[PDB]
Structure 1
Amino acid sequence: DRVLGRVTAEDVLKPGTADILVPRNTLLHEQWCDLLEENSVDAVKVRSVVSCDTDFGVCAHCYGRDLARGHIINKGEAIGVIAAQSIGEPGTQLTMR
């Protein structure tokens, strides 16, 4: 699930030499996860924030959905407001060690 809502790059390769499993800009929507579990691949290169050369916000091509939408995030949405709020939502932490 850590990579389920992520889009990989061209670095994905099959265990067999000169073999691939999925093209560069692809979303791990629902089924390729089973295939990669079959191949037992562990190291996956995925584009993320800040690494996205945009100079303003983040390009939508490295975020996925992470929402109630089964589709990729649309343009104009404010992730920053969505973020920094979910993190502090579990106000059930522990103090005094």
Structure 2
Amino acid sequence: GYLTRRLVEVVQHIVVRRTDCGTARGISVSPRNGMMPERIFIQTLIGRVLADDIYMGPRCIATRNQDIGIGLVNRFITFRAQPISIRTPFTCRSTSWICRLCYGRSPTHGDLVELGEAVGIIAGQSIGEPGTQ
């Protein structure tokens, strides 16, 4: 209870306000260095927007500003694409708010986060409620 009360009070002003902050930086997630098992590498990329085009020879698998589903992760692990650049709350250009593309896909409805959704309260609750069990 106290942990949830503190975590909610830490992040409350974080509300999705803009559609694209305009950043050009993304974190690099690789299985050989970052995620030793495959399940973690799959769970990290589900619902994340790409930051750079993923090329395989002369053909592109997925371009920038494109959501990632389980099918794209399966294609990545089949085609052996190690360097993957995704957009994350760490590479956003603000500490008071986040944009739709930096957050990604909402698991409530299954699309981009709608403007005005309190992602901070949702994150605090989703981190606090598993602590009881």
2 CA distance for matches of 1:13 and 1:51?
22
- The correspondence for 1:84, drawn from 109, 112, 124, is 124
Q: What whole-Å deviation, never above 9, does each CA across 1:36-73 have from its counterpart, x for those lacking one? A: 12212233111111422246300111222232211111
Identity %: 34
Aligned to 1:6: 48
Q: Name the residue aligned to 1:65.
A: 105
List gaps (5 residues or longer) in structure 2: 1-42
User: 2:83: which partner in 1?
Assistant: 43
Q: Which runs of 5+ in 1 are unaligned?
A: none
Measure how far apart 1:11 and its partner are. Answer: 4.8
Q: Displacement, 1:78?
A: 0.8
Deviation at 1:90, TM superposition (A): 1.6
Corresponding position of 1:27 = 67
Is residue 50–residue 58 contact of structure 1 (8 Å, CA) maintained in 2? no
How many angstroms does 1:84 deviate by?
Answer: 1.7
Q: CA RMSD in A?
A: 2.2
Q: Please report the TM-score for the alignment, with normalisation by the length of structure 1.
A: 0.75
Letter in 1 for 2:54: V
- Tell me the matched-pair count: 91
Is the helix fraction higher in 1 or 2?
2
Question: Normalising by structure 2, what TM-score?
Answer: 0.58
| SS of the residue 1:45 aligns to | strand
Give the strand-richer structure, 1 or 2: 2
- Residue pair 2:51, 2:64 contacting (<8 A) in 1 also: yes
Maintained 8 Å contact 1:49/1:58:
yes
